Amino acid sequence: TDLASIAREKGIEFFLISFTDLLGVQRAKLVPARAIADMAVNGAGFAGFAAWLDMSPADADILAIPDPESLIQLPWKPSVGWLAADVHFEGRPFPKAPRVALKSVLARAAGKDMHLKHGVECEFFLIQPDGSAISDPADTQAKPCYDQDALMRRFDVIAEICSYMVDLGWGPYQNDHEDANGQFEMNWDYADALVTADRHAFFKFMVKSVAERHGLRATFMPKPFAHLTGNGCHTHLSMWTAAGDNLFEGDGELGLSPTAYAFLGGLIGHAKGLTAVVNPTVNSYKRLNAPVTVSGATWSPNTITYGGNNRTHMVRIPDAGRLELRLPDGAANPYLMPAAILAAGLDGIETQADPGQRLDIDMYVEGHSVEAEQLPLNLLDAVRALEADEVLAGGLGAAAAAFAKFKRAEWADYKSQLTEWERRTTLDC
Amino acid sequence: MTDLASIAREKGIEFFLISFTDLLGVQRAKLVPARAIADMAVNGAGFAGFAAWLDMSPADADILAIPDPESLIQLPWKPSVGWLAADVHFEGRPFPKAPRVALKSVLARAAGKDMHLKHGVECEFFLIQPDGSAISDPADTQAKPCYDQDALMRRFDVIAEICSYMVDLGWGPYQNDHEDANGQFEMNWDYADALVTADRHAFFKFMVKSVAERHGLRATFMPKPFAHLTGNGCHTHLSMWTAAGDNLFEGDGELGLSPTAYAFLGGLIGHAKGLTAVVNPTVNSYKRLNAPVTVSGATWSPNTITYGGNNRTHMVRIPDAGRLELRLPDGAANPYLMPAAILAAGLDGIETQADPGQRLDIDMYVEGHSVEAEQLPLNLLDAVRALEADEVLAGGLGAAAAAFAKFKRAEWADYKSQLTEWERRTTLDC
Amino acid sequence: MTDLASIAREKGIEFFLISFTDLLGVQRAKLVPARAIADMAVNGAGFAGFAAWLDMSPADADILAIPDPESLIQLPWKPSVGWLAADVHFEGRPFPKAPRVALKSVLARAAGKDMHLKHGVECEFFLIQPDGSAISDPADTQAKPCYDQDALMRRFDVIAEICSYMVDLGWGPYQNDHEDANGQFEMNWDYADALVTADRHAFFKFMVKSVAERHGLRATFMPKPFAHLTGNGCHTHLSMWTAAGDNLFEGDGELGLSPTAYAFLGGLIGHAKGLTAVVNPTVNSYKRLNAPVTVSGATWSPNTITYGGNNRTHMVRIPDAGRLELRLPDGAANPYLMPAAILAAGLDGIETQADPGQRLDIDMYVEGHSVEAEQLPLNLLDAVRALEADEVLAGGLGAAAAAFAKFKRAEWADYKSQLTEWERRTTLDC
Ligand SMILES: Nc1ncnc2c1ncn2[C@@H]1O[C@H](COP(=O)(O)OP(=O)(O)O)[C@@H](O)[C@H]1O
Ligand SMILES: Nc1ncnc2c1ncn2[C@@H]1O[C@H](COP(=O)(O)OP(=O)(O)O)[C@@H](O)[C@H]1O
Ligand SMILES: Nc1ncnc2c1ncn2[C@@H]1O[C@H](COP(=O)(O)OP(=O)(O)O)[C@@H](O)[C@H]1O
Known part of the structure; x- marks a missing residue:
């Protein structure tokens, strides 16, 4: 099943699309359910330079592609769904992530x-x-x-x-x-x-x-x-x-x-x-x-x-x-x-x-x-x-x-x- | 015949305090969810004896505290928790310092x-x-x-x-x-x-x-x-x-x-x-x-x-x-x-x-x-x-x-x- | 030819600070009245070396700090006191750790x-x-x-x-x-x-x-x-x-x-x-x-x-x-x-x-x-x-x-x- 359908079943109103940077900091974007389908396939955009990824302000945004199997409905707030993601840069998984x-x-x-x-x-x-x-x-x-x-x-x-x-x-x-x-x-x-x-x-x-x-x-x-x-x-x-x-x-x-x-x-x-x-x-x-x-x-x-x-x-x-x-x-x-x-x-x-x-x-x-x-x-x-x-x-x-x-x-x-x-x-x- | 997993289910016990008394009278305990009690009851809960008052070494194998199922007490002020007294075992034998x-x-x-x-x-x-x-x-x-x-x-x-x-x-x-x-x-x-x-x-x-x-x-x-x-x-x-x-x-x-x-x-x-x-x-x-x-x-x-x-x-x-x-x-x-x-x-x-x-x-x-x-x-x-x-x-x-x-x-x-x-x-x- | 007792008399020196520097740079000193300076100048002032930074033992004989009369300095802000730098002696010999x-x-x-x-x-x-x-x-x-x-x-x-x-x-x-x-x-x-x-x-x-x-x-x-x-x-x-x-x-x-x-x-x-x-x-x-x-x-x-x-x-x-x-x-x-x-x-x-x-x-x-x-x-x-x-x-x-x-x-x-x-x-x- 896709994240959008699961959002409907489980009552998930927002997803936290999250990645871990080099210093261990959790970087995340809060996206309403209506947007998960597009983000799941294309990834969520972040400026990698603003995280600990040794990138440049002039680089294209990294795309963080959520791993749907990582999905965790926050147990203290189940209307929010947490996703772990792979950082991609210029079409390839980003090896510094x-x-x-x-x-x-x-x-x-x-x-x-x-x-x-x-x-x-x-x-x-x-x-x-x-x-x-x-x-x-x-x-x-x-x-x-x-x-x-x-x-x-x-x-x-x-x-x-x-x-x-x-x-x-x-x-x-x-x-x-x-x-x-x-x-x-x-x-x-x-x-x-x-x-x-x-x-x-x-x-x-x-x-x-x-x-x-x-x-x-x-x-x-x-x-x-x-x-x-x-x-x-x-x-x-x-x-x-x-x-x-x-x-x-x-x-x-x-x-x-x-x-x-x-x-x-x-x-x-x-x-x-x-x-x-x-x-x-x-x-x-x-x-x-x-x-x-x-x-x-x-x-x-x-x-x-x-x-x-x-x-x-x-x-x-x-x-x-x-x-x-x-x-x-x-x-x-x-x-x-x-x-x-x-x-x-x-x-x-x-x-x-x-x-x-x-x-x-x-x-x-x-x-x-x-x-x-x-x-x-x-x-x-x-x-x-x-x-x-x-x-x-x-x-x-x-x-x-x-x-x-x-x-x-x-x-x-x-x-x-x-x-x-x-x-x-x-x-x- | 006393089965802790089954009692946890019957009586609404969500956690057990597997507890033992050290030489200075301090209560040492581990809080284990019901899903783990069967294993703990047979094999014991592991503790580093060195960290309690038992005159042991940092290098010793953990002691295993084997709970006495007969001692079971659902905390009257919080019945979802079941207290158990335990015997300290070390190297497969009851530990005489306990x-x-x-x-x-x-x-x-x-x-x-x-x-x-x-x-x-x-x-x-x-x-x-x-x-x-x-x-x-x-x-x-x-x-x-x-x-x-x-x-x-x-x-x-x-x-x-x-x-x-x-x-x-x-x-x-x-x-x-x-x-x-x-x-x-x-x-x-x-x-x-x-x-x-x-x-x-x-x-x-x-x-x-x-x-x-x-x-x-x-x-x-x-x-x-x-x-x-x-x-x-x-x-x-x-x-x-x-x-x-x-x-x-x-x-x-x-x-x-x-x-x-x-x-x-x-x-x-x-x-x-x-x-x-x-x-x-x-x-x-x-x-x-x-x-x-x-x-x-x-x-x-x-x-x-x-x-x-x-x-x-x-x-x-x-x-x-x-x-x-x-x-x-x-x-x-x-x-x-x-x-x-x-x-x-x-x-x-x-x-x-x-x-x-x-x-x-x-x-x-x-x-x-x-x-x-x-x-x-x-x-x-x-x-x-x-x-x-x-x-x-x-x-x-x-x-x-x-x-x-x-x-x-x-x-x-x-x-x-x-x-x-x-x-x-x-x-x-x- | 430099006689500390006589100078104390001429210059109005009532006390001497017999001082030495230990390994950490700390100034160690004893305050001795003029009446005692002759003895101290020849034999030295005794200190327990252990109590300063000299890596010595509590059981060692006291060191004797022998003042260098040429170093004498009447404290300009308190001329009645005469500062002296000293060599630490131990067991009759200059102490190499000093x-x-x-x-x-x-x-x-x-x-x-x-x-x-x-x-x-x-x-x-x-x-x-x-x-x-x-x-x-x-x-x-x-x-x-x-x-x-x-x-x-x-x-x-x-x-x-x-x-x-x-x-x-x-x-x-x-x-x-x-x-x-x-x-x-x-x-x-x-x-x-x-x-x-x-x-x-x-x-x-x-x-x-x-x-x-x-x-x-x-x-x-x-x-x-x-x-x-x-x-x-x-x-x-x-x-x-x-x-x-x-x-x-x-x-x-x-x-x-x-x-x-x-x-x-x-x-x-x-x-x-x-x-x-x-x-x-x-x-x-x-x-x-x-x-x-x-x-x-x-x-x-x-x-x-x-x-x-x-x-x-x-x-x-x-x-x-x-x-x-x-x-x-x-x-x-x-x-x-x-x-x-x-x-x-x-x-x-x-x-x-x-x-x-x-x-x-x-x-x-x-x-x-x-x-x-x-x-x-x-x-x-x-x-x-x-x-x-x-x-x-x-x-x-x-x-x-x-x-x-x-x-x-x-x-x-x-x-x-x-x-x-x-x-x-x-x-x-x-
Ligand atoms: N074969 C294994 N490989 C990797 N991790 C294991 C393995 N077996 C157990 N673990 C994990 O090791 C952690 C510690 O287990 P634990 O039984 O408390 O070790 P011990 O009591 O010996 O200190 C637990 O997360 C446990 O699930
Ligand atoms: N035969 C016994 N052996 C051991 N303890 C006993 C015995 N009989 C009574 N006790 C206990 O001694 C404690 C004191 O009893 P209590 O009747 O209040 O003593 P008393 O009034 O004589 O001072 C109680 O815990 C009681 O149950
Ligand atoms: N030939 C020398 N050997 C050792 N020290 C000296 C010598 N000549 C001058 N000094 C000392 O060096 C210190 C600094 O002198 P100063 O003339 O102020 O140096 P500069 O102006 O070149 O930086 C003073 O204490 C001075 O007396």
């Missing part, structure tokens, strides 16, 4: 009968509308993870959103209060990478929208509070044949196949550059200065290492037939992130990359001793690692170079800023 | 000797301002406020609502009182098998806190929340039953007690110091009014390792034939570790035919200065040392004891850096 | 080759509100404020007072300027033997801070105290003299320089990265305005490892025949470690006949994007790594280098936990 970049990598893998499936653990904070503190002043204890009281104190927003995911058929299965005061997580079933990526982009918008409707605010910022741990976006990954078999399932260590370990080998070999994409902000690189590893230290790995059922590494092996990449944070682009991961993975497969030795230790503690390689310490270094990484850069195409340019400009901006701390500690130098 | 698991281990040993602990709890709590700075009722001020009719009825709405919930839940509530301190209250219900009472105890605190907050108030089970007032006890009533339904404490001796009851009592006396660490488990548990002429609420807490008689002045009171009341525990006492440690002490007393000593039919707050009675530990650190040195208790509670002690010493080091306003005001001019 | 001692070691090596470093410092500073939140003069606002006559005279009282002090002290002050940033100032004086200039540098900062505060203001030598303004340089002028009084940098080559000057310059270029760590020693030292069209005060700091010519756009300027100006250092540069590290780099250049490369007679803020010039370290951690990897510098400064690096990494770990308002505002909606 993240969803397009992802579909390209997916296409290469599918051509080898390898279909990436993933699921995302999107931690977020519920905070005051002005952003200055968490939403619950009573959520204060040192180890608040899974706090029953605080969890239920936010039952209304959490349960409302969860029920929405049930109805949407995402298979939500748990809601938690996470490690930091004010921090939460709502998990749902993994799916085909494109499906999960669309849900991911929609989910952030749904959480922000519902929080705001309850007089609160949600943030997926990696390190919103100086005194608390950060928002991870830990990602679970597996590769499937079209016929429905999990290629990662095998008879090797921990129930993993050689394909799984070669994929993991790409993740390891490509970790430095991968960091730039999945920890994509200046803020992504801040850490509590704590010798005694906080309860939430696990939100982020420090070392290019794996694995085991061990939340202390860059890659965890939770179970047979999957890998968990713990590297990504809450700012990770829903499309660029799976795309860059897949590019690194496929390469590991094609080069039969060796992931090295599994470390069955606590990398936060007994891993000071080990000569494990360290992850990039800031945005600029991660970006340089990305540019120097030919497989990764070539994997993502022109998205990589445009991304790197935006991040360098953010870096320059950042370097003009003063922290209160440096003023306090240097004024009397 | 309080509910520690308790079940002791009960199993007792049950193997055909001895079944039943207890009831007197969970005093205060109703206070949301910011915690004062009691909830500024008109509750009189020097002797206990059982004040006015103040009690002024909080009729919160108390009656919670009591009605307990009626419907089948706990057999039978009385609600204003207790000894201004702002202090208590709601009693029927004793039951220890695990049943423990689960109810854990749920009860959550219910009182939740309902208070819905009414714009706050509840606290803190031992000594106000410097000018007496404290929250968790006085505990105890009896031991055969599988066939006989109360072993019932007998022909003094006050209607059997020698078994007296030997159990003997274990409580013998293990008192270490017991204090578990049932008075916070730095705050050791604060006391400095009054030369006693006080109305002095009874909230015993000072001496003594019993008994129908006398609220001792560590152990004999309220009636067939039971002992341990008056030691305070409101911070872990709902599971407390019955566990008490049972460990009492089983040892029975096994050794422990002698409880002389019953003192005197007022221990007065006449108990004279009597050469042994004093209870005066602070957290001394209690913790007595616990670590107590083989029966430490061994009885398993690894839970050592982890508990490590946590308490860390709290103690924290406490030792703090300054009271008093010491500043009285020492600044030294 | 900056003044580190500097004297390098000078001794240079002097052993009949090479005597003389330098002068351009110590920019801002005059600011006592609370540090803004510059001291709310009327100093114009986009190009450099040498503003109005704003300069509006602070005539503090500037003239300090200048007069420098006149009486014999430093040969010759000019006072409003510098490039609003609120920024500079007071120049004659170059001198390196140790003399270093002592004066240390005293000067203290004098400016002290006099500003007496006038209800505050002075700061912080590199980048205001986000909207350029920074405080400590541009340093350098020449090397024989004992007989000849300036070795003077010669017949380009711009009146000898091959010795060019080889010295070659060492500055070769050792630039590591040098950056010492003379730009704070996290704050690496902040910069983000302007596409340069700025009036852009010159406060070089971006590239290049020279030279009478050109304020490079890391090294050749102001005139017979000297080099290193523009690298900022206001946080340790008065002793900075000349020490510079001299270590320059002596190596002379020893290796280091090639400085091509002089660039261009505007490096503009035309220096094109030129394939090497960039200076972009942050503290990278500078520190370059320093640790620099054998000549690390070896030249001795244990002072390693301790310095340890301190800077610790500051860095501290910095990495901080959030700017900018990143919160631009990332909260990610």
